[PDB]
Amino acid sequence: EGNSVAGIIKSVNETSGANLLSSLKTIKAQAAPIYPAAASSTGYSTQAKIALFGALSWILYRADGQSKAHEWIVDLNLNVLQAAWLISFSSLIPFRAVYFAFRGMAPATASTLNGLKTFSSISL
Amino acid sequence: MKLLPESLQQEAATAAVVASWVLWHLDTQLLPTIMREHKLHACWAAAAKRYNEKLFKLNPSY
Amino acid sequence: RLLKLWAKRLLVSPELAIVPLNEFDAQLASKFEGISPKYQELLSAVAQGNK
Amino acid sequence: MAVTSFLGKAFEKYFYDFSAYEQFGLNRFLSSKGQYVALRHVGFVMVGVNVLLAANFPFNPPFPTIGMCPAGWEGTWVCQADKAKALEMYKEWKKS
Amino acid sequence: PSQNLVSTFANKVIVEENLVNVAEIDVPFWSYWLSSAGFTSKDAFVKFAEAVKPKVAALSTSDITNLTVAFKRANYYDKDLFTGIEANVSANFTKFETEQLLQIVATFDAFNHSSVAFLDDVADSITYCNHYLAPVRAGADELATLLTYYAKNGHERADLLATVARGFSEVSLGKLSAAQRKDTVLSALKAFQTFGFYPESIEAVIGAALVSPAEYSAEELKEVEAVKVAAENALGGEFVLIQEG
Amino acid sequence: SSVRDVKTGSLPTNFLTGVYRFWRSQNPAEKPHDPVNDRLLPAVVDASDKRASIGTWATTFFCTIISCNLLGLMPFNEAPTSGLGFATGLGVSVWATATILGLSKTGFKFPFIFVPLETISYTFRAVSLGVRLWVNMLAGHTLLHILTGMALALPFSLGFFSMVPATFGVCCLLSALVGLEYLVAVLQSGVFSILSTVYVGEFNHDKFIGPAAKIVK
Amino acid sequence: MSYSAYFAKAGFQFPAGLSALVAGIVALNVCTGRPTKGTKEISNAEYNATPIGYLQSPDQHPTAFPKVPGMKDVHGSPHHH
Ligand SMILES: [Zn+2]
């Protein structure tokens, strides 16, 4: 669409002097960016259904292959040994510190975006 | 214990196909996104001084 | 016309209201890096918004 | 009841608010929360090993046993180092 | 009766007026790929031009570049078609790439065709709408062709001159063959002397003449020495040939 | 034909940015003799063109090996790297990539007792880089197999929930070894890609073109 | 107001060329050019003459949770060489 600043300039120039100060909250609301409101909550997507159906299919196929193996009970308790460390990772990992440490790996999120200053772009 | 596969070439080709897909997905899907997000910040950080000085010179408002 | 002019600039960026009009020329310098830092960080900090 | 949304909220309140370290009062017996996580890890491993052995206990072990035997089997298919012997003895045991 | 029936059917179903009738739908694609196959006929390219002439204003940058390269390869100038091409480039100058604009400007240079608005929009697109290292990936012959285009039209843009001057190098001139490098160096030095613009990178052009002065004539060596003296005065120093070290 | 939308500042984007910038920093560019300006910019771009994509290749191998290594630590799953041909094919492919790059630098055909010795120790990189990954992924897994076999042998014979201290000690040792397997998985992917950088970067040296003519002072 | 709801609108999505990776791994697993891991190609006369139980061999049918290690689901052909 057309840009919002030209809409500000046009609709501010179109107001009368008496109409100006109360129209300013409307004009601002017509120049505010679209932030889409929360739409319909569907169930799971067809790719999410495909993902979890294929994951459960893979887990059942792998458990059936593990049970038919020679040291089958050894494999079935290896699954317990690995799920135990998954459960302990859920408990031990400081996920907020991990998130903010990953934010420091990228330079785009390690710093605030420093660019255009206000004093150079002042219009009058 | 399993040591030797049924086919060495099939398993090496599986490794090649997986690593070639990871290479394509890195070069094509991940690196353009990463470079857009990185280089916007990097170009603004590298150009803040010269950009603000040039815009300060071009501005007749003062 | 003056009210419309300042209405446009304060609709795009209301942080200009934290620098008073008489003090503004006292901030400037010949080069941009020499502009007084009395209002710089406060202006850029107000420009992010209410959060 | 959406099938996954209620499951997500129930798993969230189980994951965060439910804590057996506080509701069973385990700060008296244990020094830390991390010591509870380690003890709960090894306890989960032990509970899993015991229920996987209890789900099927009369079977002949594929893993090598340390010269031992389960309960009163002693010389049955369960305590046979020879696996062909154990299979044929399992058939006679199954006959009953 | 296979021979006469097959021969009669092939000429009727296979001759160059019906494969102009397959090429009415996508004229840029077909004209480009038929001209690259060596099929350059004025008889077919007039029908190409009038088939594509209403479609030009909605064409993408790839299709405009393909059409423009094809009509250079045919050497068929249509004034109305290339006016439409130039209006398309002027309307969408931010979307065009330097890789495409060099090929378009080479065709607009091959026959003489220019506008002030077209030259301004091509210069704005190469200088500001494209990457500043895009002349580095260009090849020095295309940059020399664009330079003599702006020199023959008399249109002078110092920012475009700096941008296109950045593409001239020991690498880019080393990629050229010696007979091609002679024409590229001479035309680039003539354009730089016409504008009076002497950047640092002119050391790569003048040096490319003075490393191999045996291929140049005495007249061309005189004009190269004149450009060298002018660039020595403009850059405030003396031109040295640098050996391996 | 429609690409998806991405949020800026996402955790996978940030992690992958840090990983790529780590593997790119392994073989940095040489600082030229001249001050880098518009005169030296095409020589810098040409020098980047001569350099191999060791950042992209090391990031590819790091991601594809840390994924296959952490697959072995997920329940019901095995590591693809624990297979011989997979890990050794990755290693022989890295060695062949470095060899093909070095052959492209020297002219596409292959170069007293010193020449056989150094050629044997160079050709052993092909074996070594893949086999040091494969037997390491076989390592904690086969030790884990035998140890959980004895960890099953204790309550199968002493009773299901009786003699809990002995099985407690064996399950503590098992838990410590699966944690060591996690460390070895992440660390073997890292060691592989560090080695891929130092093997490919041996042939990553081309000469700077530079200016053949200057205007001094 | 934020872009959070806009990103909550988009569901789960696979990586962009995951179908090519799956169709490469599956095509490597099914275009082996050799029989399927304990089978043998036989003549059509043998295959139609042989019943379904004699074609099956007990090593390729191990028992799901075997009470003795080595239990097989089928007994194969009663005819022995
Ligand atoms: Zn295993």
Tab-separated table of N, CA, C and O in Angstrom, chain D residues 63-69, chain F residues 149-151 153-154 156-157:
chain	number	residue	atom	x	y	z
D	63	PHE	N	21.431	-61.410	28.407
D	63	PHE	CA	22.626	-60.889	29.044
D	63	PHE	C	23.292	-61.985	29.870
D	63	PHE	O	22.602	-62.842	30.429
D	64	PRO	N	24.623	-62.003	29.945
D	64	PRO	CA	25.300	-63.033	30.741
D	64	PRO	C	25.088	-62.799	32.228
D	64	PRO	O	25.322	-61.703	32.741
D	65	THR	N	24.630	-63.838	32.914
D	65	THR	CA	24.370	-63.759	34.341
D	65	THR	C	25.657	-63.999	35.117
D	65	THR	O	26.594	-64.630	34.619
D	66	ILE	N	25.717	-63.449	36.324
D	66	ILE	CA	26.912	-63.575	37.145
D	66	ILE	C	26.744	-64.830	37.992
D	66	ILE	O	26.419	-64.751	39.181
D	67	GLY	N	26.954	-66.000	37.378
D	67	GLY	CA	26.808	-67.312	38.002
D	67	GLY	C	25.556	-67.616	38.813
D	67	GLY	O	25.541	-68.577	39.589
D	68	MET	N	24.621	-66.660	38.802
D	68	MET	CA	23.433	-66.699	39.699
D	68	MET	C	22.195	-67.307	39.039
D	68	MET	O	22.299	-67.829	37.914
D	69	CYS	N	21.078	-67.257	39.768
D	69	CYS	CA	19.761	-67.785	39.330
D	69	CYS	C	18.667	-66.919	39.961
D	69	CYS	O	18.954	-66.280	40.986
F	149	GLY	N	23.735	-54.862	30.642
F	149	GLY	CA	23.551	-56.297	30.790
F	149	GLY	C	23.833	-56.786	32.201
F	149	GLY	O	23.044	-57.537	32.779
F	150	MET	N	24.941	-56.336	32.792
F	150	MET	CA	25.198	-56.704	34.190
F	150	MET	C	24.238	-55.999	35.153
F	150	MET	O	23.857	-56.560	36.196
F	151	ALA	N	23.805	-54.785	34.802
F	151	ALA	CA	22.812	-54.076	35.605
F	151	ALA	C	21.457	-54.761	35.554
F	151	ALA	O	20.614	-54.541	36.425
F	153	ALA	N	21.556	-58.127	35.228
F	153	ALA	CA	21.894	-59.406	35.845
F	153	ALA	C	21.776	-59.354	37.360
F	153	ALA	O	21.586	-60.389	38.007
F	154	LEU	N	21.906	-58.168	37.944
F	154	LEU	CA	21.759	-58.115	39.403
F	154	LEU	C	20.316	-58.321	39.901
F	154	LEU	O	20.110	-59.219	40.731
F	156	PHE	N	17.683	-59.483	38.251
F	156	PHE	CA	17.088	-60.686	37.680
F	156	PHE	C	17.328	-61.872	38.596
F	156	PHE	O	16.487	-62.767	38.714
F	157	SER	N	18.460	-61.843	39.307
F	157	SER	CA	18.869	-62.987	40.168
F	157	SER	C	18.738	-62.717	41.675
F	157	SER	O	18.632	-63.705	42.419
